[PDB]
Amino acid sequence: KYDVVIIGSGPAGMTAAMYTARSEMKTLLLERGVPGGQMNNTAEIENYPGYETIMGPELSMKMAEPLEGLGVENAYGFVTGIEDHGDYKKIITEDDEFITKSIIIATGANHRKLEIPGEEEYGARGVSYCAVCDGAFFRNQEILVIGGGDSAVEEALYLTRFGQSVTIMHRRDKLRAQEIIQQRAFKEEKINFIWDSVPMEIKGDDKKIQSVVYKNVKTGEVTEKAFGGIFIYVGLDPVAEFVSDLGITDEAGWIITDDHMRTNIPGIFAVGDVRQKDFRQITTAVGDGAQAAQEAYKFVVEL
Template identity: 60%
Template sequence: MTQHYDTIVIGAGPGGMTAAIYTARANMKTLMIDRGIYGGQMNNTAEIENYPGYVSIQGPELAEKMYASTTALGVEYAFGNVEHVMAQDALTWRVITDMDEYTADSVILATGSQYKKLGVPGEEQYAGRGVSYCAVCDGAFFKGEHVVVVGGGDSAIEEASYLAGIADRVTVIHRRDTLRAQKILQDRAFANDKINFIWDSEVQSIIGDDTKTTAVQIKNRKTGEVSELATSGVFIYVGLLPVSEPFASLNVTDEEGWVVTNDQMETTQPGVFALGDIRQKTLRQITTAVGDAAIAGQNAYAYSENVKMAKLTAK
């Protein structure tokens, strides 16, 4: 028999776990589903320095603390890749994964986003063999070597600073002549003599031999000059894409796939809420995901209470 829950949270990043804490504290039977380990992108972050209560904390450590809070409240956790979310009837949602099916009064979408790829020759070929999207995961493989970081936002500059503590030299390649990262991150990178910058340039291709990455081909956007830069590793941070494919049929996304909500985290589908980095928003941080989650969790509780009342009335 398909298990029924008061709410199902899809995604176990900081937002998803916070939403589950709020619904569980409201005595809602809560299931949290994720296709990987809880914590989301926190597990790929070496140091978190802007989360209240901690001067600095390792991403995986914060993930463990949040997860412990959910299990202490009785939140159930299931592994699975969500394939579809659909209405079973006017008051019930069905969530189908590659492993099981569940039903719920409400659903909270918290699947976040994933790193965008460059889409250049060699990127796929050398993925895992010099090409990476996670410095924390793969930085140790490049101890004492030269690595390239592509991008100019917070993630790129944070990870360049992290890699500078491992690699011999880090080169940041950015398509503009100024960074988009927070000033404190910029100042830290500019002050590090192991980090240098190539401005107004784009990676055209990633070059390697039979086993590993050996260089990148770079084109200057202003002069058109093409050159090669020898490197052992290429770390790519050029933006994010929403993980929203399973929800396309709900018609709650914009043309780029971001889920659109109001300030109550409600989508256009009654009983479907969304939070964090999957939303159409400008600031994507752990703190903003957690704030969204508190609102989504509380409103999922209010909605679930209305559903229960409607079902009693129908009887």
């Protein structure tokens, strides 16, 4: 019935849908929340070719904008499962089922948790995974950022608009983030570093976080230090539970595709951050999405 259903409306899904609709495929784009995916939790995007700098939610709106006009059908849906029935596929949401000739899975990735004491308990007051979301709650505080990659260092730099100070704690003595972002963090006077350390416990009173206990990974020295907020950026997990049984994921749960965005299962493609891959950016999300759309066309034509 649908030619293609794209699940996920971040940049990978929104590029795919734009392309399948321009190929006049009957296109369903399901999104559980707000179009734009991780871009909505991004403050300042500087490396999307074609924009000098643009706030994550404004790029989201710009990418969502032509889709209605192109005839993509945009629907709310949280997908819980997919069944392959040979020459068609069934997609299960909370309340609905959809039938489609092909599927492009574009559901992205989610923050990994530390799994340390106080992490859940301080969920609402003190622990955050999203700085653009939560940052202004920590104006004038001592903020801790955990992680050494692009998200930790970038979101730390953003957070210096709010905090008295922002400390980045990394489990080695070299960051993983892009050098230009590393150099900005080194030079920013409001950013401090705790190198070679991992958080062990998040502590507080009944209401809120007050301190973090951490350990140095080369000496095992333990330190406890006061902070008002902790933002955790220790990497990603795939958002692909609705396909755990289909045999298209690796041991870590990322969806495996070839260079044409094809899984095992014909007519089921995956794009963007949910794929098994090393470089997760808006540019390669967009490129994956265009490549999946072109291959889904081919697959549906052939059917």
